[PDB]
Amino acid sequence: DYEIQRERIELGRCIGEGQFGDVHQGIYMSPENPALAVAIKTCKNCTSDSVREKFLQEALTMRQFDHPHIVKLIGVITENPVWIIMELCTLGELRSFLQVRKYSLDLASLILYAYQLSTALAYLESKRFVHRDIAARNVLVSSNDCVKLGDFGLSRYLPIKWMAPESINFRRFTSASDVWMFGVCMWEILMHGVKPFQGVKNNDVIGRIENGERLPMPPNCPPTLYSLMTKCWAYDPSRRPRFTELKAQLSTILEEEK
Amino acid sequence: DYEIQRERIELGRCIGEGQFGDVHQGIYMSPPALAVAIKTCKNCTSDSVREKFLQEALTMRQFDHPHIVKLIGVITENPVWIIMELCTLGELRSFLQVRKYSLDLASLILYAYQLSTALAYLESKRFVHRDIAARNVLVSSNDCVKLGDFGLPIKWMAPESINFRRFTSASDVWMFGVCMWEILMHGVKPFQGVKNNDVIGRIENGERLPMPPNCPPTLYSLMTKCWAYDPSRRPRFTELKAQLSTILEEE
Ligand SMILES: Brc1cncc(-c2nn[nH]n2)c1
Ligand SMILES: Brc1cncc(-c2nn[nH]n2)c1
């Protein structure tokens, strides 16, 4: 079912670098589509079954989900060299896309990306699934008006500057900690792909959060949208909103502002 | 702050019995006269009992929902009283038993729907009720039910609550499942003639509550989802509410 014939895949150019190897773009010639554009995650040292098991674990998680704003798993090739076939997001990483398009993208498009992300996260919340790594780096751009959530293997597991205080202090990951992370991610989107807490040491971050310090309101930001992020950044997890509420709030923001 | 002057409260007839004392119906005059429920506290001269009793009011001030009992105020001077919105038709379990041959399936599905909307609101505020049963539901009118009791029910509890005292949003889903069964069973208690200690043994063996007579198999399909052994497999209230809404319209 998930096992794909290698001869149906035609490997193309290297589009990125991953945890286990190089990510490539390619073509999948199935009975349906003459040439579907795909992304091929490769694995360098996958002759070792321990590495193999770790690499293939992403595909095991991936098959459970089906959502328009989550990267779709097309298949796997378990014979060496081991490959993971995923739907291609041609425009690449969100961080990079936002940096490049800083003086072209409107606020309506920025709010749209957050909305789309909040729909994927609400779907994951419905499946009682905890992502553990919501960041602009783990978001892919399919088109000018479509973003997807990727990275379900936990590449950086340390993103201290995105983590909720209880994750830093006690390694507690819940639906509430995912909300905090989404808050930081909405800040990064409005900050046009700028990393949070620049020139601040990781060990000094928790000290600041505990003292009530937060990320400033971006220059191009509706105060109503910043009001929403500050709700995600409540110290007490039980006080943070859920993704069904954030989804609904971003809908009104999308309309009222632009 | 909800502190009310006692001269603004006129006590009436006893409408029920509560955890700390007797529940009465009454009148609250404000700048127009309003029918209220007065929760009383028998031994509230003791500050430990007082603190426990007044904790219900502290919990309640946080919520505002059409299907959740509203807190009108409190009287902290002795005798201590908690003023709440009146639900004239009383307890749900009793109302269902009485009207066993006077309620249609559409009304039964409606109560579950209304109950799922209140629970979805609580889930949004990241609140865990810990006691979802038809006994803690109040009847305002023939087509309006309210969630009450915000202060050991082995037959309603999820296996992880019995085995490890673990209470989460997933355990609340299990309890709502049992509550939907009670509603369709016209207020009949779950697992009759089964000892509390023998309940967990049955649940662990995959045993569940039977499909009530003349219950839509689609609705029973929904309860069985609430009764998944693994909490992570159970649906959330936002899904249940959406599902109950379609089942209701189909009826
Ligand atoms: Br999975 C995946 C899908 N589509 C594009 C990418 C990707 N492009 N550039 N870096 N990563 C990854
Ligand atoms: Br609180 C509350 C509100 N409205 C009715 C009651 C009640 N009636 N009978 N038992 N309890 C309680």
Coordinates of C-alpha atoms and ligand atoms in Angstrom, one line a residue:
Chain A
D1 CA 0.0 0.0 0.0
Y2 CA 2.7 2.5 1.1
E3 CA 5.5 0.6 -0.7
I4 CA 6.4 2.3 -4.0
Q5 CA 8.3 0.8 -7.0
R6 CA 11.7 2.7 -7.5
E7 CA 11.3 2.6 -11.3
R8 CA 8.2 4.9 -11.0
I9 CA 10.4 7.6 -9.3
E10 CA 12.8 9.7 -11.4
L11 CA 15.2 11.6 -9.1
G12 CA 15.8 15.3 -9.7
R13 CA 17.7 18.2 -8.2
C14 CA 18.6 18.5 -4.5
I15 CA 16.1 21.0 -2.9
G16 CA 17.3 20.8 0.7
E17 CA 19.2 19.1 3.5
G18 CA 17.5 16.9 6.1
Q19 CA 18.3 15.1 9.3
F20 CA 19.3 11.7 7.7
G21 CA 20.4 12.9 4.2
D22 CA 19.5 15.1 1.3
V23 CA 16.0 16.1 0.2
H24 CA 15.5 16.0 -3.6
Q25 CA 12.7 16.9 -5.9
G26 CA 11.4 14.3 -8.4
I27 CA 8.7 12.8 -10.6
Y28 CA 6.3 9.9 -9.7
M29 CA 4.8 8.2 -12.8
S30 CA 1.7 6.4 -11.4
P31 CA -1.2 4.9 -13.4
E32 CA -3.3 8.1 -12.6
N33 CA -1.0 11.2 -13.1
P34 CA 1.6 11.1 -16.0
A35 CA 4.2 13.0 -13.9
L36 CA 3.4 14.0 -10.3
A37 CA 6.1 16.4 -8.7
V38 CA 7.4 14.8 -5.5
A39 CA 10.0 15.4 -2.7
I40 CA 12.3 12.5 -1.9
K41 CA 13.8 12.4 1.6
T42 CA 17.0 10.3 1.4
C43 CA 19.0 8.4 4.1
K44 CA 22.8 8.4 4.0
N45 CA 23.6 5.7 6.6
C46 CA 20.5 3.5 6.3
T47 CA 22.3 0.2 6.0
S48 CA 22.1 0.3 9.8
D49 CA 18.6 -0.9 10.9
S50 CA 18.7 1.4 14.0
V51 CA 19.0 4.5 11.7
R52 CA 16.5 3.0 9.3
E53 CA 13.9 2.4 12.1
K54 CA 14.3 6.1 13.3
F55 CA 14.1 7.4 9.7
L56 CA 11.0 5.3 8.7
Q57 CA 9.3 6.4 12.0
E58 CA 8.3 9.8 10.3
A59 CA 6.4 7.8 7.6
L60 CA 4.7 5.8 10.3
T61 CA 3.4 9.0 12.0
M62 CA 2.7 10.7 8.6
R63 CA 0.2 8.0 7.2
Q64 CA -2.3 8.8 10.2
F65 CA -3.0 12.3 9.0
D66 CA -5.0 13.6 6.0
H67 CA -5.4 17.4 5.9
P68 CA -5.0 20.1 3.1
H69 CA -2.4 22.0 5.2
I70 CA -0.3 19.0 6.3
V71 CA 2.4 17.5 4.0
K72 CA 1.0 14.3 2.4
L73 CA 3.0 11.0 2.4
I74 CA 2.9 9.4 -1.1
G75 CA 4.9 6.4 -0.2
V76 CA 8.1 4.7 0.9
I77 CA 10.9 2.6 -0.6
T78 CA 12.3 0.3 2.1
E79 CA 14.9 -1.4 -0.1
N80 CA 18.4 0.2 0.1
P81 CA 18.8 3.2 -0.7
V82 CA 15.8 3.9 1.6
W83 CA 13.5 6.8 0.4
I84 CA 10.4 8.6 1.8
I85 CA 8.2 10.0 -1.0
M86 CA 6.2 13.2 0.0
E87 CA 4.1 15.8 -1.9
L88 CA 6.3 18.6 -3.2
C89 CA 6.0 22.2 -1.9
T90 CA 7.7 24.0 -4.8
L91 CA 8.3 27.4 -3.1
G92 CA 10.2 25.8 -0.2
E93 CA 10.8 26.8 3.5
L94 CA 8.5 29.6 4.9
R95 CA 11.3 31.5 6.7
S96 CA 13.2 31.9 3.5
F97 CA 10.1 32.8 1.4
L98 CA 9.1 35.5 3.8
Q99 CA 12.6 37.0 3.9
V100 CA 12.8 37.2 0.1
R101 CA 9.2 38.6 -0.2
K102 CA 9.4 41.1 2.7
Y103 CA 8.5 44.1 0.5
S104 CA 5.9 42.4 -1.6
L105 CA 3.6 40.4 0.7
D106 CA 0.6 42.2 2.2
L107 CA -0.8 41.7 5.7
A108 CA -3.8 39.8 4.4
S109 CA -1.4 37.0 3.0
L110 CA 0.5 37.0 6.4
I111 CA -2.8 36.5 8.4
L112 CA -3.8 33.9 5.8
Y113 CA -0.7 31.7 6.5
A114 CA -1.4 31.9 10.3
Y115 CA -5.1 30.9 9.6
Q116 CA -4.0 27.9 7.4
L117 CA -1.5 26.8 10.1
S118 CA -4.2 27.1 12.8
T119 CA -6.5 24.8 10.7
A120 CA -3.8 22.0 10.5
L121 CA -3.0 22.4 14.2
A122 CA -6.8 22.2 15.1
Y123 CA -7.0 18.9 13.0
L124 CA -3.9 17.5 15.0
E125 CA -5.6 18.6 18.3
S126 CA -8.8 16.7 17.2
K127 CA -6.5 13.5 16.7
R128 CA -5.1 14.3 20.2
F129 CA -1.6 14.6 18.6
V130 CA 1.1 16.9 20.0
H131 CA 3.6 18.3 17.3
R132 CA 6.4 19.4 19.8
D133 CA 8.0 21.7 17.1
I134 CA 5.9 24.5 15.6
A135 CA 8.2 27.1 13.9
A136 CA 8.4 29.0 10.6
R137 CA 11.3 26.7 9.6
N138 CA 9.0 23.6 9.8
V139 CA 6.4 25.3 7.5
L140 CA 6.6 24.7 3.7
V141 CA 5.1 26.9 0.9
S142 CA 3.1 25.1 -1.8
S143 CA 1.8 28.3 -3.6
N144 CA 1.4 32.1 -2.9
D145 CA -1.9 31.3 -1.0
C146 CA -1.1 27.8 0.4
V147 CA 1.2 26.6 3.2
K148 CA 1.7 23.2 4.7
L149 CA 3.0 21.8 8.1
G150 CA 6.0 19.4 7.7
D151 CA 8.7 17.9 9.9
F152 CA 7.1 15.1 11.9
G153 CA 10.4 13.4 13.0
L154 CA 11.6 16.1 15.4
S155 CA 14.9 17.2 13.8
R156 CA 15.9 19.5 16.7
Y157 CA 15.1 16.8 19.4
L158 CA 17.0 22.5 21.1
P159 CA 14.5 25.3 20.1
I160 CA 14.5 27.1 23.5
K161 CA 13.3 30.4 22.0
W162 CA 10.1 28.7 20.6
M163 CA 9.3 26.4 23.7
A164 CA 6.8 27.1 26.4
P165 CA 8.3 27.6 30.0
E166 CA 7.2 24.1 31.2
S167 CA 8.9 22.4 28.2
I168 CA 12.2 24.2 29.0
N169 CA 11.9 23.6 32.8
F170 CA 10.3 20.1 32.9
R171 CA 10.1 18.8 29.3
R172 CA 6.3 18.7 29.4
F173 CA 4.8 18.8 25.9
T174 CA 1.0 19.2 25.7
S175 CA -1.7 20.8 23.5
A176 CA -1.1 24.1 25.6
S177 CA 2.7 24.1 24.8
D178 CA 1.8 23.7 21.1
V179 CA -0.3 26.9 21.4
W180 CA 2.7 28.8 22.9
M181 CA 4.8 27.7 19.9
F182 CA 2.1 28.7 17.4
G183 CA 2.2 32.2 19.1
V184 CA 6.0 32.5 18.4
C185 CA 5.3 31.2 14.8
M186 CA 2.7 34.0 14.2
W187 CA 5.3 36.5 15.5
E188 CA 7.9 35.1 13.0
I189 CA 5.4 35.4 10.1
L190 CA 4.7 39.1 10.9
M191 CA 8.4 39.7 11.5
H192 CA 9.1 38.5 7.9
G193 CA 11.1 35.4 8.8
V194 CA 13.2 36.9 11.7
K195 CA 14.2 34.5 14.5
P196 CA 12.9 35.2 18.0
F197 CA 15.3 36.6 20.7
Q198 CA 18.3 37.5 18.6
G199 CA 21.5 38.0 20.4
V200 CA 20.1 36.4 23.6
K201 CA 21.6 33.3 25.1
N202 CA 19.4 30.2 25.3
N203 CA 20.1 29.9 29.1
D204 CA 19.0 33.6 29.6
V205 CA 15.6 33.0 27.7
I206 CA 13.8 31.2 30.5
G207 CA 14.9 33.9 33.0
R208 CA 13.2 36.5 30.9
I209 CA 10.0 34.5 30.3
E210 CA 9.7 33.9 34.1
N211 CA 10.1 37.7 34.7
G212 CA 7.0 38.3 32.5
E213 CA 9.1 39.5 29.4
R214 CA 7.6 38.7 26.0
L215 CA 8.3 39.2 22.2
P216 CA 7.5 42.9 21.1
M217 CA 4.6 43.8 18.9
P218 CA 5.9 43.6 15.3
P219 CA 5.8 47.0 13.4
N220 CA 3.3 45.8 10.9
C221 CA 0.7 44.3 13.3
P222 CA -3.0 44.7 14.1
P223 CA -3.1 45.2 18.0
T224 CA -6.0 42.7 18.0
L225 CA -3.6 40.1 16.4
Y226 CA -0.9 40.9 19.0
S227 CA -3.6 40.6 21.7
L228 CA -4.2 37.0 20.4
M229 CA -0.4 36.1 20.6
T230 CA -0.2 37.4 24.3
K231 CA -3.1 34.9 25.1
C232 CA -0.8 32.0 23.7
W233 CA 2.0 33.3 25.9
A234 CA 0.2 33.0 29.3
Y235 CA 2.7 31.4 31.8
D236 CA -0.1 29.0 33.1
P237 CA -0.9 26.4 30.4
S238 CA -4.5 26.1 31.6
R239 CA -5.0 29.8 30.7
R240 CA -3.9 29.4 27.0
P241 CA -6.6 29.2 24.3
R242 CA -7.3 26.0 22.2
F243 CA -6.7 25.8 18.3
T244 CA -10.5 25.8 17.6
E245 CA -10.7 29.3 19.3
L246 CA -7.5 30.6 17.5
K247 CA -8.9 29.4 14.1
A248 CA -12.2 31.4 14.8
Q249 CA -10.3 34.5 16.0
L250 CA -8.0 34.6 12.9
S251 CA -11.1 34.3 10.7
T252 CA -12.5 37.6 12.1
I253 CA -9.0 39.2 12.0
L254 CA -8.6 38.2 8.3
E255 CA -11.9 40.0 7.5
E256 CA -12.0 43.0 9.8
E257 CA -8.4 44.2 9.2
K258 CA -8.0 43.9 5.4
Chain B
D1 CA -17.4 40.7 43.0
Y2 CA -20.7 38.8 43.6
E3 CA -21.4 39.8 47.3
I4 CA -25.2 40.2 47.7
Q5 CA -27.1 42.0 50.6
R6 CA -29.3 39.3 52.3
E7 CA -32.3 41.8 52.4
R8 CA -32.3 41.5 48.6
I9 CA -33.0 37.7 48.9
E10 CA -36.5 36.2 49.9
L11 CA -36.3 32.5 50.7
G12 CA -39.0 30.1 49.4
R13 CA -39.7 26.3 49.4
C14 CA -37.0 23.6 49.5
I15 CA -36.6 22.3 45.9
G16 CA -33.8 19.8 46.5
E17 CA -30.9 18.4 48.6
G18 CA -27.3 19.3 48.1
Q19 CA -23.8 18.3 49.3
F20 CA -23.6 21.0 52.1
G21 CA -27.3 21.6 52.8
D22 CA -30.7 22.2 51.3
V23 CA -31.4 23.9 48.0
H24 CA -34.3 26.3 48.1
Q25 CA -36.1 28.4 45.5
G26 CA -36.4 32.1 46.0
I27 CA -36.6 35.7 44.8
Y28 CA -33.8 38.3 44.2
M29 CA -34.9 41.9 43.9
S30 CA -32.5 44.2 42.0
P31 CA -32.7 47.6 40.1
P32 CA -36.8 43.4 38.6
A33 CA -37.7 40.4 40.9
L34 CA -36.0 37.2 39.6
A35 CA -36.6 33.5 40.5
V36 CA -33.4 32.0 42.0
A37 CA -32.0 28.9 43.6
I38 CA -30.4 29.3 47.0
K39 CA -27.8 26.7 47.9
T40 CA -27.5 26.6 51.8
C41 CA -24.7 25.3 54.0
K42 CA -25.6 23.4 57.3
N43 CA -22.3 23.5 59.1
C44 CA -20.7 26.5 57.6
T45 CA -19.7 28.1 61.0
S46 CA -16.5 26.0 60.4
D47 CA -14.2 27.9 58.0
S48 CA -12.9 24.7 56.5
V49 CA -16.4 23.7 55.3
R50 CA -17.1 27.3 54.3
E51 CA -13.9 27.4 52.1
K52 CA -14.9 24.1 50.4
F53 CA -18.5 25.3 49.8
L54 CA -17.5 28.8 48.5
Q55 CA -15.0 27.1 46.1
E56 CA -18.0 26.1 43.9
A57 CA -18.9 29.9 43.5
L58 CA -15.2 30.7 42.7
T59 CA -15.3 28.0 39.9
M60 CA -18.6 29.3 38.5
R61 CA -17.8 33.0 38.2
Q62 CA -15.4 32.0 35.3
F63 CA -18.1 30.6 33.0
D64 CA -20.8 32.2 30.8
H65 CA -22.7 29.7 28.6
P66 CA -26.4 29.2 27.7
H67 CA -26.2 25.5 29.0
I68 CA -24.3 26.1 32.2
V69 CA -26.0 27.2 35.5
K70 CA -25.2 30.9 36.1
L71 CA -24.0 32.2 39.5
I72 CA -26.0 35.3 40.5
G73 CA -24.1 36.0 43.8
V74 CA -23.0 34.9 47.2
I75 CA -23.7 35.8 50.9
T76 CA -20.6 35.1 53.0
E77 CA -22.0 36.3 56.3
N78 CA -23.5 33.4 58.4
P79 CA -25.8 31.6 57.3
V80 CA -23.7 31.3 54.1
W81 CA -25.7 31.2 50.8
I82 CA -24.9 30.7 47.1
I83 CA -27.4 32.4 44.7
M84 CA -27.8 30.6 41.3
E85 CA -30.2 30.7 38.3
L86 CA -33.4 28.6 38.9
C87 CA -34.0 25.5 36.7
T88 CA -37.7 24.9 37.7
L89 CA -38.0 21.3 36.4
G90 CA -35.1 20.0 38.6
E91 CA -32.7 17.1 38.2
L92 CA -32.4 15.4 34.7
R93 CA -32.3 11.7 36.0
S94 CA -35.6 12.3 37.8
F95 CA -37.3 14.2 34.9
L96 CA -36.4 11.4 32.5
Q97 CA -37.7 8.6 34.8
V98 CA -41.0 10.4 35.2
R99 CA -41.5 11.1 31.5
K100 CA -40.4 7.6 30.3
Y101 CA -43.6 7.5 28.1
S102 CA -43.8 11.3 27.4
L103 CA -40.4 12.1 25.6
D104 CA -39.6 11.5 22.0
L105 CA -36.1 10.5 20.6
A106 CA -35.6 14.0 19.1
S107 CA -35.8 15.6 22.7
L108 CA -33.4 12.9 24.0
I109 CA -30.8 13.7 21.3
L110 CA -31.4 17.4 21.9
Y111 CA -30.3 17.1 25.6
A112 CA -27.1 15.3 24.6
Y113 CA -26.4 18.0 22.0
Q114 CA -27.0 20.8 24.5
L115 CA -24.8 18.9 27.0
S116 CA -22.0 18.6 24.4
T117 CA -22.1 22.4 23.7
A118 CA -21.5 23.2 27.4
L119 CA -18.7 20.6 27.6
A120 CA -17.1 21.9 24.4
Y121 CA -17.1 25.4 26.1
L122 CA -15.5 24.0 29.2
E123 CA -12.9 22.2 27.0
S124 CA -12.1 25.6 25.3
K125 CA -11.5 27.1 28.9
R126 CA -9.2 24.0 29.5
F127 CA -11.5 22.9 32.4
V128 CA -11.9 19.3 33.5
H129 CA -15.3 18.7 35.1
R130 CA -14.4 15.2 36.6
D131 CA -18.2 14.3 37.1
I132 CA -20.3 14.0 34.0
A133 CA -23.6 12.1 34.8
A134 CA -27.3 12.8 34.2
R135 CA -27.7 13.5 38.0
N136 CA -25.5 16.7 37.7
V137 CA -27.7 18.0 34.8
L138 CA -30.7 20.4 35.6
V139 CA -33.8 21.0 33.4
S140 CA -34.8 24.6 32.8
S141 CA -37.6 23.8 30.3
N142 CA -38.8 20.9 28.1
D143 CA -36.2 22.0 25.5
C144 CA -33.4 23.4 27.6
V145 CA -30.9 21.7 30.0
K146 CA -28.2 23.2 32.2
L147 CA -24.9 21.8 33.6
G148 CA -24.6 22.0 37.4
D149 CA -22.4 20.7 40.3
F150 CA -19.0 22.5 40.2
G151 CA -17.5 21.3 43.5
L152 CA -17.1 7.6 44.0
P153 CA -18.8 7.2 40.5
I154 CA -16.8 4.1 39.4
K155 CA -19.5 3.1 36.7
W156 CA -19.1 6.6 35.0
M157 CA -15.3 6.8 35.2
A158 CA -12.8 6.0 32.4
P159 CA -10.4 3.1 33.1
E160 CA -7.4 5.4 33.8
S161 CA -9.4 7.4 36.4
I162 CA -10.2 4.1 38.3
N163 CA -6.7 2.7 38.0
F164 CA -4.6 5.8 38.3
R165 CA -6.9 8.8 39.4
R166 CA -6.0 10.4 36.0
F167 CA -8.6 13.1 35.0
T168 CA -8.2 14.7 31.6
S169 CA -10.3 16.0 28.6
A170 CA -10.3 12.3 27.3
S171 CA -11.8 11.0 30.6
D172 CA -14.5 13.6 30.4
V173 CA -15.4 12.3 26.9
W174 CA -15.8 8.7 28.3
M175 CA -18.1 10.1 31.1
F176 CA -20.2 12.0 28.4
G177 CA -20.6 8.7 26.6
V178 CA -22.1 7.0 29.7
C179 CA -24.3 10.1 30.2
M180 CA -25.7 9.8 26.6
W181 CA -26.4 6.1 27.4
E182 CA -28.4 7.1 30.7
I183 CA -30.4 9.7 28.7
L184 CA -31.5 7.1 26.1
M185 CA -32.0 4.6 28.9
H186 CA -34.6 7.1 30.5
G187 CA -32.4 7.7 33.6
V188 CA -31.4 4.1 34.4
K189 CA -28.1 3.7 36.2
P190 CA -25.2 2.0 34.3
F191 CA -24.0 -1.5 35.3
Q192 CA -26.9 -2.5 37.7
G193 CA -26.1 -5.4 40.0
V194 CA -22.3 -5.2 39.2
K195 CA -20.0 -4.4 42.2
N196 CA -17.8 -1.3 41.7
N197 CA -14.6 -3.4 42.1
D198 CA -15.8 -5.8 39.3
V199 CA -16.5 -2.9 36.8
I200 CA -12.8 -2.3 35.9
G201 CA -12.3 -6.0 35.3
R202 CA -15.2 -5.9 32.8
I203 CA -14.0 -2.7 31.0
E204 CA -10.4 -4.2 30.7
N205 CA -12.0 -7.4 29.1
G206 CA -13.5 -5.2 26.4
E207 CA -17.1 -5.3 27.8
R208 CA -19.3 -2.2 27.2
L209 CA -22.8 -0.9 27.9
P210 CA -25.4 -2.4 25.5
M211 CA -27.1 -0.4 22.7
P212 CA -30.3 1.0 24.3
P213 CA -33.7 -0.1 22.7
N214 CA -34.8 2.0 19.7
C215 CA -31.5 4.0 19.7
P216 CA -30.1 5.1 16.3
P217 CA -27.1 2.8 15.6
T218 CA -25.2 5.9 14.4
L219 CA -25.6 7.4 17.9
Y220 CA -24.4 4.2 19.6
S221 CA -21.5 4.2 17.1
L222 CA -20.6 7.6 18.6
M223 CA -20.7 6.4 22.2
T224 CA -18.4 3.4 21.4
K225 CA -15.9 6.0 20.1
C226 CA -16.0 7.7 23.6
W227 CA -15.4 4.3 25.2
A228 CA -12.0 3.5 23.5
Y229 CA -9.7 2.1 26.1
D230 CA -6.8 4.3 24.9
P231 CA -7.5 8.0 25.8
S232 CA -5.6 9.3 22.7
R233 CA -8.1 7.4 20.4
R234 CA -11.3 9.2 22.0
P235 CA -12.9 12.1 20.1
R236 CA -12.9 15.7 21.3
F237 CA -16.1 17.6 22.3
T238 CA -15.9 19.9 19.2
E239 CA -16.3 16.7 17.0
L240 CA -19.0 15.1 19.2
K241 CA -21.1 18.3 19.1
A242 CA -20.8 18.4 15.2
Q243 CA -21.8 14.7 15.0
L244 CA -24.8 15.1 17.5
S245 CA -26.0 18.1 15.5
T246 CA -26.3 16.0 12.3
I247 CA -28.0 13.0 14.2
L248 CA -30.5 15.5 15.7
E249 CA -31.5 17.0 12.3
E250 CA -31.9 13.4 10.8
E251 CA -34.5 12.9 13.6
Ligands
LIG1 BR1 8.9 17.2 2.5 C1 9.2 18.7 1.4 C2 8.3 18.9 0.4 N1 8.4 20.0 -0.5 C3 9.5 20.8 -0.4 C4 10.5 20.6 0.6 C5 11.6 21.5 0.7 N2 12.0 22.4 -0.2 N3 13.1 23.0 0.3 N4 13.4 22.6 1.5 N5 12.5 21.6 1.8 C6 10.3 19.5 1.5
LIG2 BR1 -28.3 25.2 41.3 C1 -30.1 24.7 41.0 C2 -30.9 25.4 40.1 N1 -32.2 25.0 39.8 C3 -32.7 23.9 40.4 C4 -32.0 23.1 41.3 C5 -32.5 21.9 41.9 N2 -33.8 21.6 41.9 N3 -34.0 20.4 42.5 N4 -32.8 20.0 42.9 N5 -31.9 20.9 42.5 C6 -30.6 23.5 41.6

